Amino acid sequence: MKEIKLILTDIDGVWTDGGMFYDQTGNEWKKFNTSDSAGIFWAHNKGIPVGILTGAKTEIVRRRAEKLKVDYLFQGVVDKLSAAEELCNELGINLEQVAYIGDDLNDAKLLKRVGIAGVPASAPFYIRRLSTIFLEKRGGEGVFREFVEKVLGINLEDFIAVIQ
Amino acid sequence: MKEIKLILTDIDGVWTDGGMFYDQTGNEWKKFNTSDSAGIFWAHNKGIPVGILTGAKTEIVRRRAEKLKVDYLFQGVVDKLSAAEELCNELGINLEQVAYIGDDLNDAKLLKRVGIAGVPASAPFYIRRLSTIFLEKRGGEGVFREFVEKVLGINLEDFIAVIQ
């Protein structure tokens, strides 16, 4: 497993199954999976910061980001590759030292440039073929957790050490 | 690849899995799937307008339609065939140049008349046989996106060209 210094992730279609709940009054919901917070846990356990990139801008995601202690949150992103580059240069790392997971069209550019590109099984075929590792899980099923565990080579020894 | 001038689509059981959330107070929810908006984009990339027909009238749909910049919106539609005939007249096109996707009884008459008819896998056997192309996906799983991409013949080359 190649050395990683940054994990970026998309939200919708990764942290969720793409569901967007509208009510009659202009409110909106997302369904996260508690399983994904272990992604943050494993990352921080290994001293790796985690960033979120999202085209949308919601209080929904901002609260979730906050509670999970994500290192970086970037909502309203127009160009994900662009936002990723800014942050890399900000952190003095390059894209090759980055792991990214996204599920749709606006992810494809960044996915093509990163050290490890992950895509959920639920994603469309032309995006899915951009992944450089296989992810069994679908968005919403803890696929962020799967990505992180595979990217940092988490193993039974790590597990054993954290429950002692 | 029949010449398509108009893509029309039902809402419930196509954009959703038929789910209708009711609370204790009269509010109501639908769960849409972000993946479906890629349906509008590919449509628009090809200069094809999209119209929504629905027997229901909800603020839920109005907001989602507006958010996705759907070309035409008809709610309360008592008769889907006629309502499509009208927009076809008001556009100088023929039903044959229309792609429609629906999942249920009140879509049946319009499905039999269109040039391309799609029914999602989750639909009742009677409707599913009226489909003129096979759709692998279920309501709410991005079956509207699958439809548009089939109807419009979207290919890898299209994808390569919009991610630049």
Add this chain to the structure above:
Amino acid sequence: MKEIKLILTDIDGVWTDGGMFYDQTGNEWKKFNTSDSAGIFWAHNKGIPVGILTGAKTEIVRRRAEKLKVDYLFQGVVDKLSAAEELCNELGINLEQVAYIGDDLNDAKLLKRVGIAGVPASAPFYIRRLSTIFLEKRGGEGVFREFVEKVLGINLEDFIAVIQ
């Protein structure tokens, strides 16, 4: 099939997948499937009324029942068999003329007494084995519709007739 004069049905685990959504404020949700309203349609089309029995009492159900045009609604029913018997005595029919569908312990006593007993595939084994007809569909997947269609023998001809 038998001569059915009343169709009865449970709510949670039949008309839903058993999901009960609680929020932080005391409110509650259920998710119905639009597919199931076709169940009422066919019943009413063949001249057969539909009743709902439910041990729970919610505005969720009452409004859904009303929207769907359900003939009868009994909530907070602790003995579903008593409830059905009273409705039968008032209609002038017996239980062998009833088709009932439920999914759990408090439906067993009624299930064993009616002319046609349906049980969704998702139900616990002890309840499934009481089913007198096979149902492929799970709670909330439009299994009430499937029940009605099997009980009344809905066929392609019936479909052809009603789509004008």
Add this chain to the structure above:
Amino acid sequence: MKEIKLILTDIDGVWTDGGMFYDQTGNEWKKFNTSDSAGIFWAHNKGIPVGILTGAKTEIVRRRAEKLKVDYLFQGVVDKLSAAEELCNELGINLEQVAYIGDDLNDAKLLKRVGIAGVPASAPFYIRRLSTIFLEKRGGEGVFREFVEKVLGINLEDFIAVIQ
């Protein structure tokens, strides 16, 4: 099965599929499954108290706990093992006489200590392999009920006797 005098259980990832719904206002939802109340039913039928251990604290869970008449409710638990030990001391009982079901890292320590350990099929492999009985169901699917019926040896005769 071995003699069990107390059944304990996690919430998220067991009573739910791990879903955590966020709206734009800071409110929050969990999705329970009515099937799981039967687990409480069977426990009480046999004179076994049930306890909830959870690291979170929500009105969501307090309300559910009350509705289902759960004997013990511990929220805000930092250490699930010591919470179980404290209650075990209170009831005059040993961990060997406890059945516990959990699904994630914070459940591991307790799971390796109890008489019977249950882990839903949806859990991480690391946790799953601590289960001492196989469980088919995923969290939110009625896996708490499954756990209870296996732990207490509920059989056809039990069922027959309570539907009299």
